[PDB]
Amino acid sequence: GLRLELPLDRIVKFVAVGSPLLLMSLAFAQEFSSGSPISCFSPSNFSIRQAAYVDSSCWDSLLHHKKSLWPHKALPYSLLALALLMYLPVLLWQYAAVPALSSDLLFIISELDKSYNRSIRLVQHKERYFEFPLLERYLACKQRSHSLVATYLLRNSLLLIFTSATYLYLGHFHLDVFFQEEFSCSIKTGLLSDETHVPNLITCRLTSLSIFQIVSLSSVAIYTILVPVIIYNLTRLCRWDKRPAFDLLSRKMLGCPINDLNVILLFLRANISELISFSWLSVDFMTLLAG
Amino acid sequence: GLRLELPLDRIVKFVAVGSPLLLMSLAFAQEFSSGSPISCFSPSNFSIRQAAYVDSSCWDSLLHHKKSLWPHKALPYSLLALALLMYLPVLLWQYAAVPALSSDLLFIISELDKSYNRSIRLVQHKERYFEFPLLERYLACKQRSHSLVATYLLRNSLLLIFTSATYLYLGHFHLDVFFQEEFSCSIKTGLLSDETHVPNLITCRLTSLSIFQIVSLSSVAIYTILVPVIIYNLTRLCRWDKRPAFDLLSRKMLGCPINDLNVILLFLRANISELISFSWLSVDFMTLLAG
Amino acid sequence: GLRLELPLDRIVKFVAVGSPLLLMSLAFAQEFSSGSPISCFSPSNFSIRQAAYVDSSCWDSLLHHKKSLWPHKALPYSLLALALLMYLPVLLWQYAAVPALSSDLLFIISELDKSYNRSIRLVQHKERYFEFPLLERYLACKQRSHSLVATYLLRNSLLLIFTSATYLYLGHFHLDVFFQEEFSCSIKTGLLSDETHVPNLITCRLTSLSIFQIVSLSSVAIYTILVPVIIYNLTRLCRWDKRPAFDLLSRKMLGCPINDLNVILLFLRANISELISFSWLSVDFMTLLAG
Amino acid sequence: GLRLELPLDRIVKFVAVGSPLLLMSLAFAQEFSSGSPISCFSPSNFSIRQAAYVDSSCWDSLLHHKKSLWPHKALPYSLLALALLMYLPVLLWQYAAVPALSSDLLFIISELDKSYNRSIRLVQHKERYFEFPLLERYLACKQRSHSLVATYLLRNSLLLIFTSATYLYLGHFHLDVFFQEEFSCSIKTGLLSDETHVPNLITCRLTSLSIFQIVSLSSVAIYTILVPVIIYNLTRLCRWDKRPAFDLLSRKMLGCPINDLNVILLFLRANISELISFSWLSVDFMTLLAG
Amino acid sequence: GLRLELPLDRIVKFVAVGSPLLLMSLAFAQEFSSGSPISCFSPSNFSIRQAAYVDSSCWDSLLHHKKSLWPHKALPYSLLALALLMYLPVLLWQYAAVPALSSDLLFIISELDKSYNRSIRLVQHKERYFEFPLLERYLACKQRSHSLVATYLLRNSLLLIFTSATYLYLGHFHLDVFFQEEFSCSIKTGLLSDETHVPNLITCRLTSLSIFQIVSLSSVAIYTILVPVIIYNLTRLCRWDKRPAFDLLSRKMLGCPINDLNVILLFLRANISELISFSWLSVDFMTLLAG
Amino acid sequence: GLRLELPLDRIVKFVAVGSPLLLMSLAFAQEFSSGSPISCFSPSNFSIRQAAYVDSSCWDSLLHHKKSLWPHKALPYSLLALALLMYLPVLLWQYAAVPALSSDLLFIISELDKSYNRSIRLVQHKERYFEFPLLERYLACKQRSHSLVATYLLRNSLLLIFTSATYLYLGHFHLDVFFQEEFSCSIKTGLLSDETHVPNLITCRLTSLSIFQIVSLSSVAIYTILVPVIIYNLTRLCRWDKRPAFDLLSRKMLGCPINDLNVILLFLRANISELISFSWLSVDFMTLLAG
Amino acid sequence: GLRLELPLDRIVKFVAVGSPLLLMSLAFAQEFSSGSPISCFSPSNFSIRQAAYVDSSCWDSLLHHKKSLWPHKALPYSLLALALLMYLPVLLWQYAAVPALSSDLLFIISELDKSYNRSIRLVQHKERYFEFPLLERYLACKQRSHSLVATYLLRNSLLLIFTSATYLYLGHFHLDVFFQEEFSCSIKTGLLSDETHVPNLITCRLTSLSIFQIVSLSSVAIYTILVPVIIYNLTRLCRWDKRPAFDLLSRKMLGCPINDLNVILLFLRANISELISFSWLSVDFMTLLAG
């Protein structure tokens, strides 16, 4: 029943994955309802099937003559790609960091409990500093590594990079097609030319500009909101974490803070409820700890 | 099986989250049924496709010429945003207050049970005042804090602020479009101008004014009803809570009532059924307590 | 596995909550099927879209000129409100009476079982009257209260009040629109006036008068049926309830019958199967009770 | 795991409740499919909307001029009412007879098992007649009552009464509208009069006469079949039921057969598998019973 | 975990009940899809609604003038009735034979196991013939009865009778309407007569003759296949069943084979896996049985 | 948790049953979508209903005049019949072979384990050849039988026969209608003759030739692939199976290989994981087997 | 609870199987929505049914005259075949390698645990090299085999081969039909010729070119991404795997690396968490291992 993810990262992943899916569903469920996502004012003597042909041709082309409006067609697929892009760092953390850290937390929790139990017999009263050789050798070995701190940094770095990519994509493509609801589509380009019945230019109107605007604005707003929490999570480990065995923990509590020790200390602090935290909530001393 | 939420707050959160979703579903399920949410009286010689083009264009524009009716289009999305705004304080309370308070309740419950068991042997008859040092040191440490009382106040403060925001939004936007069921829409503004067939102004009628009025009135009524219960919950802790170990509880029962002691006392009173409340329901005395 | 609700109240709540929902579903499921809930005999030269505009406008207005038929539009929503109005007393009883009464029943059941077990050793043969001080002090304390009897009365009072409100609403609004299946609707009131093509008055017919009549009659009938059972439940406690420990129960069996003793006695009688009711089904005596 | 209902009554209740629901579903699922349940031969120059108006008006009126065909409209609702009418006696038996009889069966089963166990020690060989005072006093008390036999009779009486009511309703209303598939409907009665375009009389045809005939015939047939089993169940207890402790049972096996003893004897016989029925299947004697 | 039904009867009941339901679903799911199950070649000047009226009238009448085609309309209901007719014998066997036979099998299995255990102590080496008085008295009592063999015969007899009824119905009604896909329907019989516009006779074509033919042929084929297995099951008990305690079984293995002994012997043989069948699979002898 | 089916036969049955169902669903789900499965080029002056009549008549007839195209109509039903034809051998194996073989495997497994346990005490060191009389008598009795080997052969024989039947049906019927997408249908054969308006011959086109071709080709390909695995399974037992107790197994390992011994040996080899296969994976010797 | 698949192969199989199904669903769900997947500009005097006939005929033919566009019709079926082609290697690995390897891992894990337990008693201080004869004989027997390494290589080889086949198919067929949205279809080839009304050539346009392009590009991209991980998995075993009993493991750690030893070593390393890995996470020595 161990908890292997910080509470903030859980809600960050949930929001970042869920929101593009919700926006994509809000766009799929409207164009199926309204029918065609584009209308065209065909001439009066175009019967019925020729009007449908004009509609389909202008929707397929999507090129304003008098310049290109391709983002309208590729909205839900581009939104769906964002879901996979957000889900990739979660998969990386799931399949690259949690197996080692799970064992590293279980072992340290068990031996911390054992050390507390051993110190209990000393409480009811110095062969204590050397009494835990494992807690010094193992912790010195892990402090010199750089194994999974890199993955923890890189997950947030990837999330920030993809957020910046979304910013660039939106601000470079969707901005130039705002407030553009109609365009002059043409079909007299290929073999249909040299045929006098069909007019030269046909006006057509997009029927889903509101969905486009709402999706763009909402996505920009939420992915703006989601940046400070990400940078806070990234910068959380930069400052040194401070709250018998805890004395030995504080003994090697110094130096550059970029190790594997900081992440396991953070996960230990976030999982303090597993071990006996009776004395943790009450922040002489031996008399109080006697009970 | 501990209960970590007051019964009143449960129903308040349930109502405040559920009702905008129900109203939004009552609006989605009608415009899909009736087809277009707006009709237009196109001229007789407009064939079929041109009438649909006029309908779609006037629905997209939604601007009365002879002034703007944008709330009609943005009703379900604005209602959906209210659901997230209501759900945010619940998330804050879930992820910021309940972990510490759960441990603080478990510890106090266990040691209260232990103290009652110890006093039982004294019942069947003064080393009793000093017999519980933890119940004095821990309770004095928590009484000097201000940790989670701020969150408890801020949840209700946020709910009140968002209710006021809903009031302002409704009374500033929806009021000026009541009793307005039809408008003169125009399409001869862009490239469609200088074309004599289409008339200058086309009358159009909204087919969902009843849903608009009903949703607005119902939402105003329910969020009016939900205010006194919120202010009662906020003001509940302002008055000091009054009902061996309970004597020590009453001993430090004084001073300014804004501490972390008041909230844990309220949760203890609301969870009296966990411990032995045999003597609680019967509100000399030692002879009665002997059984 | 305690039973905390009388069997009659269960079926009363089930009927009173379920029936408006069933009637509302019988009205939603028909107007979605038949299409428009109102038809209009537009002139022959009105094309197609103008007829739909006339239909929508007359349905939105719903005002007979040659007086108002608004109950037809607001039938399912008014029926849905009745469901919440019926559900409110159930919520009140669930969140205001059952927690105290559950403990009060558990304690009395356990101590009744203990007293029966103690009297068993006296059966196989006067320090018996004073042998149960708790059963006298606790029962005298509860007999002087007025705590949850008020809630039990007020639940049925609220149900009766809401039934009377439904009576008044139906008999004051739905009665004047019976046998009215068609009306002369007009659209030439606003900007559509001074336009000679549209006629002055257009006949329209309601296509759901049968559903209206059936719903009204059925609701009146069932809420007429549901009144005598409610008044019987309310008047049940007015008469004093009569069927070692039961001798002490009969000892304080007198006085004004409006206490908290009557309701707990009723719940004890309705939950006689929990304790040992071997002698209850066989209604000298010590010889029979020896087995 | 006690069985509290006779096998015949189970299938009777299942058939009587299920069949009207099945017939109602066979009528709902057809008129939604075919569209309108009535067609009308409007004149050729009635455009499109006027034909729909004529259809809806004639369906709402449903009055043959050259006399009333209201059963066609009220078929599924009248069938649905039969489901509740059939379900009411089941509810009465569930909430009025089974709680007392459950305890009365459990007690008699347990003490019968105890008596058999006591007689076992006498088998391996007269203080036996007086050895079971409870089996005589309790059984004499129950034989003088009339408590739940009245409910058992009244359930079948109510079922028979409602079957007779269904017979009367069908044979008094549905018989006069058989072989009537078309009628002359009129709409020129109210304000539509003094208008020369609409003809005086319009022929209309019912499109669901086959469903009407099939439902009527099937319901009559099944509720004819269901009567002899009901009367057999009612008359089952009139004849006295005949198959140490069973000798005492046979000792008071006489007199008028209308008591509470007959019903509990029937339920005991139908639940013979609960106790040790090893000797029941083998229908000197002590030597055989020794094993 | 006893098995109370022969494997062959299980598949027979499954096929006989499932197949009419499958055929009925294959007919419901096609006429809902294709729309109307009958088309009519109305004249050119019949507008739109008059053609629908002609279609509905000819479908309702279904009477060839120049003789009756009623089986086409009543196909799915007649197929549904066959499901209940097939299910009735299963209900009879479930509610009339299995309760007695279950106890009769449990008792004989337990005492057979006991006898085998007793003979085990004699194996490791004549007070054996009289050692099982119950196995002789009980088996002689059951051999003289005729209780449930009649039900076992009557179930298969009813299945055969209903198969013959299906044969007669199909071969007497469906045969005369094969290769008949169109007919001359008339509507000028009632009040529509003396009206010159509608022609005297209108040709109409059935659009579901293929479904009719396929259903008829398939049903005939499968219910032909299902007869030999039924007659084999019926004739199975006519021949005497042959494979310490089994010696006593063979001792009364003679006489007329129509008893209750044959059916319980068949069920014992079909449930040989319940008891110790170690020696059954190996079909001197005492030396082999020693292990 | 015994495994009673070879892994190859599992996938063979899964493929052979699933694939016709998948192909049938790929044909049902297309003709419901496209509407009519056949179109006809009716003349210009045929109104609307006469065109539908022509379509339905030509689809029902399906007879090219200038020869018969009946396989197009009977594709999904003929595909559905193949599912039952494939499922029949699985039912035969389930209800005719597995009950005897299950017991025969359980007994041999248990006694093999017992023999291994007995030989264990001899390992840690000739009364061993005669030490297992059952393993010789029972195995000699089963080797002389021919009971369930016939069923095992006949299942694969039936599968091969039905595959050959499918080959013959496809290659004899579907081959002559390939590359035939249109035909000249006629309706002027019966009473519609001697009527000048309808032309003599009407061209019609099949709209589902692609589905026909794809289904035919895919089915031929997969049932070609499925033949070598079937013949391998059939020929598997023809060669003698070769890998204290296993010495006795090898002792009677000779003669004609068509017995019941081969199938139980195959199932034993396929279920080697049930017993102790510690020495099986390591393929002097007594020293190695000591551990 | 053993893990029998490498984590990388799990995600590879998941992606390779899921993605063609997702792409196929993205193509099925669009052409059902838009209606026909192809439109045609029929002449004005073609009524309604002739236009539908032209549409269906041109969709069935799909042959540009002025060369063949068959990939458009066969997109979802060709995508569905890829799912089975990807699933086949997973089935091969499931039914050909995992049963032997499961036992081979269980045995080695159990005996490794036993050896560690035996060495524990030697830790707390040379009959150790010969102390594990099984770990040498069994491991030498498996090192000389080539049984399941071939299957492990062949699974990835098959995946690479099918990826190359997909590359060839796409680049040889889909490339020549890009940027081709319309074609000149003809119907005047068969019996419809010599008929002057229908024109010689009819222009038609594909309405699903965007789906075609998106599916092709996306599939190419993802199956390009999936190649380096496959080749990494294939090349993983080529390099020798390096990290009392582990000394014996290192003793035969040499030679050509193509054996069955490498795969079981890889699976042991990937399943290190099953056994006691307390000393694994802490990478003199005996003093540290004493705890």
Curated annotation (Swiss-Prot), chains A, B, C, D, E, F, G:
Which InterPro entries does this UniProt record tie to the protein? Innexin (IPR000990), Pannexin (IPR039099)
Where does the record say carbohydrate is attached?
45
Q: Does the keyword Cell membrane apply?
A: yes
What is this protein identified as? Answer: Pannexin-3
- What transmembrane ranges does the database entry give? 14-34, 79-99, 159-179, 211-231
User: Record's PROSITE patterns?
Assistant: PANNEXIN
The chain's Extracellular topological domains, given as residue ranges, are 35-78, 180-210
Q: Name one GO cellular component term.
A: endoplasmic reticulum membrane
Which catalysed reactions does the entry list for this protein? Answer: Ca(2+)(in) = Ca(2+)(out); ATP(in) = ATP(out)
Q: What does this protein do?
A: Regulator of osteoblast differentiation by functionning as a Ca(2+) channel in the endoplasmic reticulum which regulates calmodulin (CaM) pathways. Allows ATP release into the extracellular space and activation or purinergic receptors.
Q: Which Pfam families match?
A: Innexin (PF00876)
Which keywords label this protein? Cell junction, Cell membrane, Endoplasmic reticulum, Gap junction, Glycoprotein, Ion channel, Ion transport, Membrane, Transmembrane, Transmembrane helix, Transport
PANTHER family, alphabetized: PANNEXIN (PTHR15759), PANNEXIN-3 (PTHR15759:SF3)
Q: Which organism was this protein described from?
A: Homo sapiens (Human)
Subunit structure, interactors included: Homoheptameric.
Stretches of the chain found on the membrane's Cytoplasmic side? 100-158
A biological process term (GO) from this entry: monoatomic cation transport
Its record classes its membrane topology as: Multi-pass membrane protein
Q: Which family does it belong to?
A: Belongs to the pannexin family.
